[PDB]
Design a protein around this ligand. Structure first.
Ligand SMILES: Nc1ncnc2c1ncn2[C@@H]1O[C@H](COP(=O)(O)OP(=O)(O)OP(=O)(O)O)[C@@H](O)[C@H]1O
Ligand SMILES: [Mg+2]
Lengths: 1078, 736
């Protein structure tokens, strides 16, 4: 184990051991040779290269072989598997080692032996006892020539491809021979005698090889690539071969290079090539030294006095040219600066600039002329160029500022005027630094100063430029802001406070307000918070989005590096976050259904020591206010609010668990019902939605339910709480205690706080009473083969699920049809609350009837909704229920992979009930029959069915004409009919029931439209994925839903008609259908 | 192109000239433009150069002087876009061109990712058709309403609707195009370009091969341009040409991360001379990416820089290694979507963005954690293009419908830490190309012999719980989790990381192997419950190793009480680190408030009144932040802060620790001065009912984990249980 550990690292294990003990040394050698093996997840090799690499890289294998071969009394006793492995290793070594006497060796193993020469020589001398020197030297020389020709090919290919855009050259066979890797036998190189060696690179002739040798001698010589490119331009497209390129393209280049060579050798070159081909070596010569040394590589001749003086000429010419440029730019900035002055040494300079000379020698009279301008800079003349071209800028400064002292206040005037952004605030500082740097020549400049003073000023500008090399760019981007620089001094009242200043203002006197607005709009988080900033007496209101973008703007302020700014901005951000979070908890509560916070409102004074001001919409409880720092008060208020939300969801879950019928409606329908039932003459919306429990509810029955629900004992209890509460409020000094006790009393005794509503208990009692007056309870037995105590899962098929359910319910002839209860048609993205309500309706004790509760299209619920639904179902079976419930779940046959079908695999009834289509048709048609003595719109239909689906194979037949003629036939009888004919054109795909519900809303919420109204729905041919669910929700279940609002109930006496044009084909046959033909 | 202001290291490909051409002609004729193309098609660069090239009267060229002035109004197009945003942008430019010279001033819109919101759920690009004809909607057409539009998209665009514009649908950049762009990018220096011109064509060939190899669009043009700029900078700084290590480093850095791509092999096949036969690991590539040289970014302007890094990992391991052996001297800030209860996401991302901006201005490294929520607010800063002004770099950072330029320091690096699966299946390809990919998950840093250390320690700690004893009549096999609290089948990797980091020398001498193994053993046993260390006498380890490890557990390491641990800790110095952060796991009950008072009572010499923090009350991040700020504000030296975290309760304070820990360290890195030491201790109470095994392992890097049985001191029993092992109950009652 220890030797396995040691050889796992790359250390040496045995190097000088005195271990003459034979058996034990053999045991440790077996251990090392079984644990130093190249394990690759468990004895994979099937190859000989890796074994050889391990042989040649391990400092203990050669010692092991030495020790095992020195004496014959050790190998005999090592191990059976270890001896097998070292025999395999010796065989592998012999295989790769008899190969080197021939060319059969592989190149990779050859470089591997050359990089471990000592290891290989020792192991070869060891194996010799069972040539080395000459064979290995000859082989390495062969390899060296191999790499020499390979690099020749590489460089020739690269150079001929650098101009690949001009000409293409087919490279014989090398283009494929060189392409392949270096994993081929050495014998392919064919090292022949009688001397020459022709390798796998079938070179056309040795002339190409010597051309490649010269090209690699000047592969990097920049001058050579320029010459070669310009001579390659001479050919121009052309598919040309190698042999003729030598004289078409290489020979002219080499000839020009050779002639230019002897030209520089003579020192007779002219200035035309000096400024034509040496134009990219400006202020860079050492690499030019090495390039010109590369130049003398090709000719086997010395370099003793050739590059030094010639590069001196090059650098002196470059200095001369940069001096001309500096002189002309300094004269330009001088004449632009307006100073007359005197230099009197640059006239000969510009005269020479207007001169042309042809010689490569040293200008000798110009040494004194350039002495004044030897080492100005290679950079830094660009600053003066910018100064020269920015005449407008300096003219404006000397028409506006004209001095250095007032600048100290000028930028200050800018700082307030500049914007809040980082760019806006950095403009002032960049302009300030630019003018501070350039005052050396912009302010210390007279209309007449001499050369020496100008140079001293240039020197002090130089020492002003050493620390900031960006000064010219500061001048540039400040000059580009000339309009702002103009308008800052003539600045009028800038009426825009700031992002940070307005932060301080809203922190100083901000008033956050939560209202839950009484106007018609929604209760979305955007419309439930407002902000007031007062002043004078103007007061600006702020919306949530405006506040959020304000937060963005002051969150992207620049760097002011002070405690005040960042502390105040983060305080404002923090109070905004806590305010939004209280809004969050409040809106969660509001959507939970509270009746205590509907008329709640809250003012939060962001001012320090501003506190909070709560308010409730009732006269029997006084206002609630605090004081203190807003941040921890708001934290406490939010913690208490969330805890109250948890308690409220708990109490509503418990109270729903007691009354069944109060589990019918959704939470917001509960709050609407509690509000409405206290009205003496309730509107028709809640009457219609009560018609789903009592059925055909009226004012008298509802007042009977609401009058026989309460007792005077409850009134005494409320009087007790009213006489008890205010002193409880005054008991706790601060508001936290009185808040906790008011909310606790609300949870325990609610109905006294709002003597204009009903609590959950009163609502449940009223609904139960309406159930008691509305008798003849509905009974529905299960089908054959369906268990009556456990979930009945069915996997029917997408075109059969709905008929399956409609046949399951057929087994109750002459029983009233199902409604939104016990029949839940699921759609993707269905609110969890609706399935929770269905599960409650199917697992409550108080039902006065046995009914089958069906969950259609179960797989279509989302993943998270399905998970929550299953958790609630398991919980509700865990606590308590009635053990005679009929629960049927229907899924799609091909959609078994979803959550709720997978989780009911054990609770599966592989039966798939169904009934013949005429049976379902007779069921539905007979149950749609309106009884006589009802004064219905169905009288004109095919003898009273109040439902019709109008369809045809092709359009343009007159289905709408049939609808209108039925309407006018009804108009013919029952004179003075004024019968409305609503038309709804459902047109978008992914059909939405809310649109048709809303269009249907204003028609029976009036009670003056109880007269027969022949509704006529119509459809468009782009509704592909939304027909069946809506059709079955409206015509069969007789209801229209909304998660948070009223419920529309189809009524027996309002005739409905749905056009549908021509999957669904079987479905349309279910309802009492009419069809028309051309 | 020549009339436009020049920029060094810009290539004259047909691409760029074509986009800027079509752009200048269309916004002059007020014609919509729908420039599409794969990432690296120079569309955004075309937008910027057109914006800064077509100024009216102050134009650098006389031709752009005779042409109009342009004032675009940007509008980023996130997939969560609303038509109100584009309507607002259009109204803004309609006001902008209202009252100004129509023939010399024109305002246009740009939707840099218009193709992204083609299938947004809110139907954003559905009122654009009337907008691009009569200026605005639900109102009269009028002058000062006609507005240009450049619908830049990095994705294939629907042509049927957008036909009214000009679809300049850029194709795949051909090999000649790539060699031309190669020539143009390195145009900054003439001399080295003629030395490195040869490599350009094989680079293009290999890049096209790799781009056509993987169906996924993991590699693109931005990587190629970064590669060529990197080799350009390396050659120009080295001034002698190119050594093969430089080329392989460049291709490795700008091409990596993808699992089924041996891009090094693909490039080196076409470059047989540019072979490398030595091993170069991801660790040094990260060290080069994050720590650019002193000679780097030291000359005029910043044309040549590395890209921001995006580490690909799995099981969220990158932070451990990065904080162990790379983040030296200065610890970068860590930004994340804090998991504290009831924090709104918008405020949190705003705060993260502000911290990002502060770091960029100051020049302190940023290590991100969540990008699927702030990618749309960073890719412009991840575009690495700078709007220079005063010689200072400025980048666009955007919050909602608000994009604002902001400063960036010249010494600033950014790291995005993400897992392999999330990037490969959720990360957008433009972000992939904007970010320099690199995979360093768990094994890249780990040497093979260090993996052997891992397995040997694994088998060593697998039999540490292996005890067979008849001291009790019971048969309960002990898991390695229970003997070493926290162990999670992976903590061996983290602990060996910690060990090699502690060694520091990081070589192989056959002595470092042994000592790293032994320090790893020490770190393991430092998180071992005392009952286990005393049962160790009869466990499968043996009974001499039992004595030795018990000695180390009770004599060298301190495990009697929290106060003894604090004294021993504060007595000794550290690795010059201003602060030391220790995590404490306990079975005793968390301190209750008088205990910290007495704790300071015997810490009157070193501590500064340590404060305890209950994590069930911090229903906001800022409560913790303000507490930490207060604790740093109070005077003193060698202060101590302790955070209690009961894992065994009904609360949710189980993963929240993560957020809290980062926050605390973040606060220090941004709120501690330069003249006070800090010690932060995180204490957690665990049970022996299996909650002491379901607890995650040794969070490595910047958390020294350790296990104290009971926090409170014990005056009654002795502090050394080995003597109690030696003596019997009788010997406890002997008289003097
Ligand atoms: N002609 C070019 N020569 C050299 N580099 C270029 C060229 N065009 C673009 N780049 C490089 O591309 C990056 C800028 O790309 P840019 O942001 O313009 O992308 P894009 O293709 O327009 O797409 P997107 O719309 O996603 O931004 C820089 O890193 C820059 O170096
Ligand atoms: Mg019709």
């Amino acid at each position: 184990e220890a030797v396995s550990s040691a050889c796992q690292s790359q250390t040496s294990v045995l190097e000088g051991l005195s271990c003459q003990d034979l058996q034990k040394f053999g045991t440790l050698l077996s251990a090392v040779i079984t644990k130093s093996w190249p394990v690759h997840n468990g004895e994979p090799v099937f190859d000989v290269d890796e074994i050889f690499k391990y042989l040649l890289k391990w400092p203990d294998v050669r010692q092991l072989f030495e020790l095992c071969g020195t004496n014959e009394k050790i190998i005999d006793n090592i191990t059976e598997e270890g001896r097998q492995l070292m025999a395999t290793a010796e065989s592998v070594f012999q295989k790769v080692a008899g190969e080197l006497e021939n060319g059969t060796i592989v190149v990779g193993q050859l470089e591997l032996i050359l990089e471990h020469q000592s290891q290989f020589l020792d192991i070869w001398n060891l194996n010799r006892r069972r040539d080395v020197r000459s064979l290995l030297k000859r082989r390495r020389d062969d390899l060296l020539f191999l790499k020499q020709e390979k690099r020749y090919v590489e460089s020739l290919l690269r150079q001929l491809g650098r101009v690949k855009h001009l000409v293409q050259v087919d490279f014989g066979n090398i283009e494929i021979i060189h392409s392949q890797d270096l994993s081929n036998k050495k014998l392919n190189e064919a090292v022949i005698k009688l001397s020459y060696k022709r390798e796998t690179h079938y070179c056309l002739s040795p002339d190409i090889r010597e051309m490649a040798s010269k090209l690699d001698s000047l592969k990097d010589s920049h001058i050579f690539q320029d010459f070669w490119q310009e001579t390659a331009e001479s050919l121009n497209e052309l598919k040309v071969s190698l042999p003729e390129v030598l004289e078409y393209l290489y020979n002219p280049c080499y000839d020009n290079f050779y002639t230019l060579y002897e030209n520089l050798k003579s020192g007779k070159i002219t200035f035309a090539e000096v400024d034509a081909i040496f134009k990219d070596f400006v202020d860079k010569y050492d690499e030019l030294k090495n390039d010109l040394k590369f130049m003398c590589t090709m000719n086997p001749q010395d370099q003793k006095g050739w590059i030094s003086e010639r590069v001196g000429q090059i650098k002196e010419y470059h200095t001369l040219h940069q001096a001309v440029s500096s002189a002309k730019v300094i004269l330009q900035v001088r004449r632009a600066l307006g100073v007359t002055g005197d230099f009197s040494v640059l006239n000969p300079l510009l005269n020479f600039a207007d001169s042309f000379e042809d010689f490569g020698n040293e200008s000798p009279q110009f040494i004194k002329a350039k002495q004044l301008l030897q080492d100005i800079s290679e950079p830094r003349q660009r600053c003066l160029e910018e100064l020269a071209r920015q005449t407008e800028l300096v003219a404006w400064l000397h028409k506006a500022l004209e001095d250095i002292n007032e600048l100290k206040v000028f930028v200050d005037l800018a700082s307030i005027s500049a914007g809040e952004n980082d760019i806006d605030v950095d403009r002032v500082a960049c302009f300030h630094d630019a003018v501070q740097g350039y005052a050396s020549l912009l302010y210390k400049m007279d209309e007449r100063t001499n050369f020496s003073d100008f140079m001293n000023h240039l020197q002090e500008l130089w020492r002003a430029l050493d620390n900031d090399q960006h000064l010219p760019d500061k001048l540039k981007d400040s000059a580009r802001n000339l309009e702002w620089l103009k308008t800052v001094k003539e600045s009028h009242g800038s009426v825009e406070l700031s992002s940070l200043s307005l932060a301080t203002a809203i922190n100083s006197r901000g008033v956050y307000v939560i209202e839950a607005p009484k106007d018609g709009q929604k209760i979305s988080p955007d419309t439930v918070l407002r902000l007031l900033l007062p002043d004078p007496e103007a007061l600006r209101t702020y919306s949530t989005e405006e506040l959020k973008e304000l937060l963005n703007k002051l969150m992207l302020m620049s760097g002011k590096k002070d405690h005040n700014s960042n502390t105040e901005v983060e305080k404002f951000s923090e109070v905004f976050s806590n305010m939004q979070r209280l809004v969050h908890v409040f809106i969660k509560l509001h959507c939970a259904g509270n009746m205590l916070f509907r008329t709640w409102t809250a003012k939060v004074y962001c001012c320090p020591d501003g506190g909070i001001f709560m308010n409730f919409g009732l006269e029997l409880l006084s206002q609630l206010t605090e004081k203190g720092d807003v941040i921890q008060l708001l934290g406490a208020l939010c913690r208490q609010m969330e805890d109250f939300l948890d308690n409220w969801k708990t109490v509503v879950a418990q109270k729903r668990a007691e009354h069944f019928y109060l589990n019918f409606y959704t939470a917001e329908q509960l709050v609407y019902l509690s509000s409405e039932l206290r009205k003496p003459r309730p509107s028709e919306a809640a009457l219609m939605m009560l018609s789903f429990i009592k059925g055909k509810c009226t004012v008298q029955d509802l007042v009977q339910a609401t009058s026989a629900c309460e007792s005077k004992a409850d009134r005494y209890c409320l009087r007790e709480v009213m006489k008890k509460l205010p002193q409880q409020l005054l008991s706790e000094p601060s508001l936290m205690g009185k808040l906790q006790v008011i909310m606790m009393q609300s949870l325990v005794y609610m109905s006294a706080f709002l003597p204009h509503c009903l609590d959950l208990d009163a609502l449940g009692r009223c609904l139960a009473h309406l159930a008691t007056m509305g008798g003849t309870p509905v009974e529905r037995p299960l089908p054959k083969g369906l268990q009556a105590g456990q979930p009945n899962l069915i996997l029917c098929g997408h075109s059969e699920v709905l008929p399956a359910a409609l046949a399951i319910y057929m087994q109750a002839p002459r029983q009233p049809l199902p409604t939104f209860d016990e029949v839940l048609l699921c759609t993707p993205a269905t609110t969890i609350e609706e399935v929770e309500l269905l599960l409650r309706r199917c697992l409550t004790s108080g039902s006065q009837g046995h009914k089958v509760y069906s969950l259609l299209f179960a797989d279509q619920l989302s993943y998270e909704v399905g998970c929550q639904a299953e958790e609630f179902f398991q919980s509700l079976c865990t606590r308590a229920h009635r053990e005679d419930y009929q629960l049927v779940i229907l899924c799609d046959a091909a959609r078994e992979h979803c959550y709720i079908p997978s989780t009911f695999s054990q609770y599966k009834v592989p039966l798939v009930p169904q009934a013949p289509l005429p049976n379902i048709q007779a069921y539905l048609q007979s149950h749609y029959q309106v009884p006589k003595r009802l004064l219905s719109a169905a009288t004109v239909f095919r003898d009273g069915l109040c439902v019709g689906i109008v369809t045809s194979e092709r359009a343009g037949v007159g289905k709408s004409l049939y609808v209108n003629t039925l309407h006018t036939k009804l108009k013919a009888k029952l004179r003075d009919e004024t019968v409305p004919l609503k038309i709804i054109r459902l047109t978008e795909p992914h059909l939405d029931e809310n649109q048709v519900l809303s269009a249907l809303l204003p028609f029976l919420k009036e009670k003056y439209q109880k007269m027969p109204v022949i509704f006529h729905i119509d459809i468009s041919t782009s509704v592909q994925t939304g027909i069946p669910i809506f059709l079955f929700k409206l015509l069969i279940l007789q209801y229209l839903m909304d998660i948070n609002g009223k419920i529309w109930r189809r009524s027996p006496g309002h005739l409905y008609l749905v056009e549908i044009p021509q999957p669904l084909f079987k479905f349309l046959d279910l309802f009492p259908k009419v069809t028309c033909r051309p | 192109l020549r009339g436009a202001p020049i920029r060094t290291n810009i290539a004259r490909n047909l691409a760029l000239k074509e986009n800027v051409f079509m752009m200048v002609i269309c916004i002059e004729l007020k014609i919509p433009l729908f420039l599409v193309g794969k990432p690296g098609s120079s569309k955004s660069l075309a937008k910027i150069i057109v914006a800064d090239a077509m100024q009216g009267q102050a134009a650098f060229s006389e031709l752009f002087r005779c042409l109009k002035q342009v004032h675009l109004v940007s509008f980023q197009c996130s997939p969560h876009s609303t038509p109100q945003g584009i309507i607002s942008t259009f109204k803004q430019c309609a006001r902008f061109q209202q009252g100004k010279d129509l023939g010399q001033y024109v305002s246009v819109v740009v939707l840099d990712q218009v193709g992204l919101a083609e299938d947004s759920p809110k139907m954003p690009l559905k009122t654009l058709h009337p907008l691009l004809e009569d200026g605005c909607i639900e109102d009269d057409p009028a002058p000062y309403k006609k507005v240009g539009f450049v619908g830049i998209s990095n994705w294939a665009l629907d042509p049927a609707k957008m036909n009214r514009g000009i679809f300049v649908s850029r194709g795949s950049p051909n090999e000649k195009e790539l060699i031309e762009s190669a020539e143009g990018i390195c145009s900054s220096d003439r001399l080295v370009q003629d030395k490195i011109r040869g490599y350009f064509a094989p680079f293009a060939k290999a890049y096209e091969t790799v781009c056509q190899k993987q169906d996924k669009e993991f590699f693109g043009l931005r990587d190629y341009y970064s590669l060529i700029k990197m080799v350009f900078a390396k050659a120009k700084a080295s001034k002698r040409g190119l050594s093969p290590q430089d080329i392989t480093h460049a291709v490795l850095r700008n091409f990596s991360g993808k699992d089924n791509i041996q891009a090094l092999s693909i490039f080196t096949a076409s470059l047989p001379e540019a072979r490398y036969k030595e091993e170069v690991s991801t660790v040094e590539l990260i060290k080069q990416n994050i720590y650019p040289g002193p000679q780097a970014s030291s000359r005029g302007l910043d044309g040549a820089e590395s890209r921001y890094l995006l580490v690909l990992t799995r099981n969220y391991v990158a932070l451990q290694i990065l904080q162990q052996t790379f983040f030296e001297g200065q610890q970068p800030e860590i930004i994340f979507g804090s998991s504290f209860p009831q924090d709104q996401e918008y405020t949190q991302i705003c705060r993260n963005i502000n911290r990002v901006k502060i770091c960029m201005e100051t020049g302190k490294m940023v290590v991100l954690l969540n990008l699927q929520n702030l990618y749309e607010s960073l890719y412009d800063a991840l575009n690495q293009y700078y709007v220079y002004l005063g010689g200072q770099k400025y980048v666009d950072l955007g919050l909602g419908t608000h994009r604002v330029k902001c400063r960036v320091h010249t010494a600033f690096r950014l790291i995005v830490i993400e897992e392999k699966d999330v990037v490969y299946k959720q990360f957008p390809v433009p972000l992939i190309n904007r970010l320099e990919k690199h995979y360093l998950d768990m094994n890249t840093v780990l040497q093979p012999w260090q993996k052997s250390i891992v397995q040997e320690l694994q088998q060593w700690a697998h039999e540490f719980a292996d005890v067979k004893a008849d001291q009790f009549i019971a048969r309960h096999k002990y898991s390695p989790a229970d003997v070493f609290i926290g162990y999670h089948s992976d903590a061996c990797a983290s602990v060996v990381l910690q060990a090699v980091e502690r060694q520091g020398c990081r070589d192989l001498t056959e002595e470092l192997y042994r000592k790293v193994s032994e320090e790893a053993r020490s770190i393991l046993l430092d998180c071992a419950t005392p009952d286990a260390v005393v049962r160790l006498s009869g466990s499968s380890l043996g009974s001499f190793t039992a004595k030795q490890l018990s000695q180390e557990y009770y004599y060298a390491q301190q495990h009697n009480s929290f106060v003894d641990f604090l004294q021993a800790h504060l007595r000794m110095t550290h690795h010059e680190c201003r602060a030391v952060f220790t995590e404490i796991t306990t079975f005793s009950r968390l301190l209750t408030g008088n205990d910290c008072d007495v704790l300071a009572s015997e810490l009157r010499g070193l501590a500064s009144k340590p404060v305890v923090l209950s994590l069930q009350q911090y229903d906001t991040e800022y409560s913790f932040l303000k507490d930490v700020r207060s604790w740093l504000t109070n005077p003193g030296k060698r202060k101590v802060l302790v955070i209690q975290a009961d894992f065994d309760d009904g609360t949710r304070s189980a993963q929240l620790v993560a957020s809290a820990k980062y926050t605390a360290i973040n606060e220090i890195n941004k709120t501690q001065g330069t003249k006070d030491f800090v010690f932060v201790y995180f204490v957690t109470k665990l049970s022996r009912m299996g909650s002491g095994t379901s607890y995650v392992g040794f969070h490595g890097g910047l958390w020294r984990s350790v296990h104290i049985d009971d926090l409170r001191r014990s005056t009654i029993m002795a502090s050394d249980v080995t003597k109690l092992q030696n003596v019997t109950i009788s010997q406890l009652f002997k008289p003097e």
